[PDB]
C-alpha cells in the first residue's frame, strides 16, 4: 500500500502521545530498519533519536549510514553534529581533523570545527583554523550559501576576538568592530538575495537586528559615543519593523527600548526617558527597569517635601508598583514604622496574581532583613535573584547577611574588629561572588571580593 508509511507514522504518533512511551517511539523506526536496510533508514532513525535526544545511538546509526553511503556529505555533517552533541569532545575533534585532512573544501566542516574548538576553550587552534579558510573563500561571491558561510565565519571570528578579552580593559577593540561591520554588510547582502529568491527573510532580519543590538551594546560599553549609538539604534528599530514583525516579535523591540531608556537615563533627560518608559508600559506591563526609572525620576522631582504622600497615592492607584513599594519600605525602616509597612505589603500581595514575582519577593526579603530576621530574608532574596534585575542588590544583601548578621560596624576599635564564623559561610560568599562576576557589575564585584 502506498499509504503504509503514513499509516505507520500515524500509528506511532498515537502510540507516544496517547500511551506516553518513548521506547515504543524508538521501536517504530527500529523495526523499519530491522525489516529491510536501505540508504535512508539509518538517517531517519538518527533523526528520530535526535528528536528524542539520544545522541549515542543516533551517532552509531549515522556511522552505519556512512558505512552504507560512501561520501554523503549530509551524513558527514550529521555525524559531526552528533559527535559534538554527545559531550565527548576528543573523538569529535579527531573526526573533524580527519575529515578536514580528507577534503579541505568543506566550509561547514570548518565552521563546526571552530565552534567545537571554541566550546572546548582552545582559542589558538580555533583561530588558526578559522582565519585561513575564511580569508580564502572569496571566489564564489555570487552564490548565496557561500555568502552565508562567510558571514557565519566572520561572526564567529568576532566572537573569538571578543572572548579573549581579560576583564577590566576599557579600550575599544577595532578589529571586532570591523568584523561586525563586515558581518552586517554581508547579512544585508544575503537578506537582499533571499528577497530576490522569494524565501522567508524575517529570520535573517531579526538575527541582523540582534547583531545590531550587540554592536550597540559593545560600543556603548567602552566609548560614550551617544550620537552614534542613537543613530544605530534608530536604524535597527527601522530595520526590525518590516512585514508582520510588529506583532509577532516583541522581545526585540523590548530590548531596543530598554537600551534607549538606559541611554536617556545616562543623558539625564527626565521627559524623554519618561516618554520611553510610557512606551514600555504600553508594551510590557511587567517591566522592572521602567518602574525603577520612574521611581528614580519621581525621587528627582520630589525627595522630602511631600514625596511620601504622592508615593502612597501611586501605590493606591496601581496594585503592584514594586519600585515605589521598595522605596516606601526603605522610608518606613528609616522612620521606625514597619507595621504599616507590613500592612502595605499584605495589601499589595493580596492582588499580586502570582506570589513569586521577583519584585514582590525582593521587597519581602528586604522587609524581613530590616525586621531583624536573617533566615526568611535570605530565603526570599535567594528566590528573588532569579531575574535580570534586582540580581546585584539581592546578591549584595545576601553577602552582607552572611558576613554581618547583626548589622554593626565592620571593624570595631574597642576589641578585635574582624568577625570570623566557621567555614561554610565563606564558601557560600565565594559562590555568590562567582554569580556576581557574571551577573553583577565589575566594581561592586571587586568591593565584595575585597
Q: How far is the CB of 432 from other proteins (least distance, A)?
A: 9
CA 369-373-376 angle, to 5 degrees, is 80
Q: Which three cell numbers stand for residue 225?
A: 559615543
Residue 293: φ, ψ to 5°: -70, -35
Q: Which is nearer to other proteins, 223 or 430 (CB)?
A: 430
Q: How far, rounded to the nearest angstrom, does the alpha carbon of residue 240 sit from its chain's CA centroid? A: 19
Return d(Cα 391, Cα 185) in angstroms, integer.
36
Q: How far is the CB of 282 from other proteins (least distance, A)?
A: 24
Q: Which is nearer to other proteins, 53 or 351 (CB)?
A: 53
Q: Which is nearer to other proteins, 235 or 430 (CB)?
A: 430
- Among the listed residues 6, 51, 87, 372, the single contact to other proteins using CB under 8 A: 87
User: Is position 88 an interface residue for other proteins (rule: CB under 8 A)?
Assistant: yes
CB under 8 A: which stretch of 119-127, 152-160, 190-198, 229-237 binds other proteins? 119-127
Residues numbered 360 to 379 that lie near other proteins (CB under 8 A) are: 375
DSSP type of residue 395: H
User: Is position 430 an interface residue for other proteins (rule: CB under 8 A)?
Assistant: yes
Phi/psi region, residue 121 (left: phi>0; alpha: psi -120 to 50; beta: rest), is left
Q: Cell 522631582 sits at which residue? A: 301
Q: SS3 of 166, please?
A: coil
Q: Cell 550559501 sits at which residue? A: 145
Closest to 90 in 3D by CA, of 118, 64, 117 = 117
Closest to 180 in 3D by CA, of 211, 222, 205 = 211
> Hey, what's the torsion of the CAs at 146, 147, 153, 156, to 10 degrees?
-140
Q: Which is nearer to other proteins, 409 or 438 (CB)?
A: 438
Q: Which is nearer to other proteins, 84 or 315 (CB)?
A: 84
Q: How far is the CB of 357 from other proteins (least distance, A)?
A: 16
User: Is position 123 an interface residue for other proteins (rule: CB under 8 A)?
Assistant: no
CA 130-191-129 angle, to 5 degrees, is 5
CB under 8 A: which stretch of 198-206, 289-297, 311-319, 423-431 binds other proteins? 423-431
User: Is position 51 an interface residue for other proteins (rule: CB under 8 A)?
Assistant: no
- Among the listed residues 20, 101, 121, 351, the single contact to other proteins using CB under 8 A: 121
- Among the listed residues 4, 18, 35, 90, the single contact to other proteins using CB under 8 A: 90
User: Is position 53 an interface residue for other proteins (rule: CB under 8 A)?
Assistant: yes
Binding mask 318-357 for other proteins (x = CB under 8 A): ----------------------------------------
User: Is position 1 an interface residue for other proteins (rule: CB under 8 A)?
Assistant: no
Q: What distances in angstroms separate CA 16 from CA 19, 23, 24, 28, 131, one per listed residue?
A: 6, 9, 7, 10, 47
b/e burial code for range 226-237 (CB count within 10 A of at least 16 → b): eeebeebbeebb
User: Is position 181 an interface residue for other proteins (rule: CB under 8 A)?
Assistant: no
User: Is position 431 an interface residue for other proteins (rule: CB under 8 A)?
Assistant: yes
Return d(Cα 39, Cα 303) in angstroms, integer.
76
CB under 8 A: which stretch of 155-163, 230-238, 362-370, 424-432 binds other proteins? 424-432
Q: How many residues bind other proteins (CB under 8 A)?
A: 25
User: Is position 422 an interface residue for other proteins (rule: CB under 8 A)?
Assistant: yes
- Among the listed residues 100, 120, 307, 429, the single contact to other proteins using CB under 8 A: 120
DSSP-H helix ranges across 86-143: 89-102, 107-119, 123-136
Check if the beta carbon of residue 281 is closer than 8 Å to that of residue 287.
yes
CB under 8 A: which stretch of 5-13, 85-93, 233-241, 297-305 binds other proteins? 85-93
Check if the beta carbon of residue 390 is closer than 8 Å to that of residue 358.
yes
Q: How far is the CB of 192 from other proteins (least distance, A)?
A: 29
User: Is position 302 an interface residue for other proteins (rule: CB under 8 A)?
Assistant: no
DSSP type of residue 423: S
User: Is position 55 an interface residue for other proteins (rule: CB under 8 A)?
Assistant: yes
Where do contacts with other proteins occur on this chain (CB under 8 A)? 23, 53, 55, 85-90, 119-121, 375, 382, 388, 422-425, 427-428, 430-431, 434, 438
Amino acid at each position: 500500500s502506498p499509504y503504509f508509511l503514513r499509516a505507520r507514522q500515524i500509528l506511532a504518533d498515537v502510540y507516544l502521545d496517547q500511551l506516553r512511551d518513548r521506547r515504543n517511539y524508538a521501536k517504530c523506526y527500529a523495526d523499519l530498519i530491522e525489516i529491510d536496510p536501505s540508504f535512508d533508514n539509518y538517517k531517519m532513525l538518527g533523526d528520530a533519536l535526535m528528536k528524542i535526544r539520544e545522541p549515542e545511538e543516533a551517532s552509531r546509526a549515522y556511522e552505519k549510514a556512512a558505512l552504507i553511503k560512501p561520501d554523503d556529505e549530509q551524513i558527514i555533517q550529521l555525524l559531526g553534529l552528533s559527535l559534538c552533541q554527545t559531550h565527548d569532545y576528543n573523538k569529535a575533534l579527531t573526526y573533524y581533523e580527519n575529515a578536514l585532512r580528507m577534503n579541505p573544501k568543506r566550509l561547514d566542516l570548518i565552521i563546526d570545527l571552530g565552534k567545537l574548538c571554541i566550546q572546548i576553550k582552545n582559542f589558538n587552534r580555533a583561530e588558526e583554523i578559522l582565519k585561513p579558510d575564511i580569508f580564502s573563500d572569496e571566489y564564489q561571491l555570487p552564490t548565496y550559501q557561500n555568502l552565508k558561510r562567510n558571514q557565519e565565519g566572520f561572526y564567529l571570528i568576532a566572537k573569538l576576538n571578543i572572548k579573549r578579552t581579560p576583564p577590566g580593559v576599557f579600550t575599544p577593540i577595532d578589529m571586532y568592530r570591523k568584523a561586525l561591520k563586515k558581518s552586517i554588510q554581508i547579512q544585508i547582502d544575503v537578506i537582499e538575495k533571499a528577497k530576490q529568491e522569494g524565501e522567508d527573510v524575517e529570520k535573517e532580519r531579526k538575527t541582523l537586528a540582534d547583531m545590531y543590538i550587540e554592536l550597540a551594546k559593545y560600543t556603548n560599553q567602552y566609548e560614550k559615543n551617544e550620537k552614534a549609538t542613537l543613530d544605530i539604534l534608530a536604524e535597527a528599530s527601522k530595520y526590525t519593523n518590516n512585514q508582520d514583525t510588529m506583532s509577532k516579535t516583541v522581545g526585540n523591540q523590548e530590548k531596543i527600548l530598554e537600551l534607549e531608556v538606559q541611554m536617556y537615563f545616562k543623558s539625564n533627560q527626565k521627559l524623554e526617558c519618561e516618554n520611553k518608559c510610557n512606551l514600555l508600559l504600553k508594551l510590557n506591563p511587567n517591566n522592572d527597569l521602567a518602574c525603577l526609572t520612574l521611581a528614580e525620576l519621581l525621587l528627582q522631582k520630589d525627595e522630602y517635601s511631600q514625596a511620601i504622600e504622592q508615593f502612597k497615592k501611586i501605590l493606591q492607584d496601581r496594585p503592584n508598583n514594586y519600585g515605589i513599594l521598595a522605596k516606601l519600605i526603605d522610608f518606613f525602616r528609616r522612620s521606625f514604622q514597619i507595621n504599616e509597612a507590613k500592612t502595605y505589603i499584605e495589601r499589595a500581595e493580596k492582588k499580586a496574581t502570582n506570589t513569586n514575582d521577583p519584585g514582590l519577593c525582593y521587597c519581602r526579603g528586604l522587609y524581613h532583613k530590616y525586621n531583624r530576621s536573617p533566615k526568611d530574608a535570605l530565603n526570599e532574596f535567594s528566590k528573588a535573584k532569579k531575574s535580570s534585575q534586582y540580581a546585584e542588590e539581592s546578591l549584595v544583601n545576601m553577602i552582607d547577611i552572611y558576613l554581618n548578621p547583626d548589622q554593626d560596624l565592620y571593624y570595631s576599635n574597642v576589641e578585635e574588629g574582624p568577625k570570623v564564623v566557621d567555614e561554610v559561610n565563606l564558601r557560600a560568599c565565594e559562590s555568590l561572588l562567582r554569580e556576581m562576576q557574571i551577573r553583577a557589575s565589575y566594581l561592586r564585584y571587586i568591593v565584595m571580593e575585597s
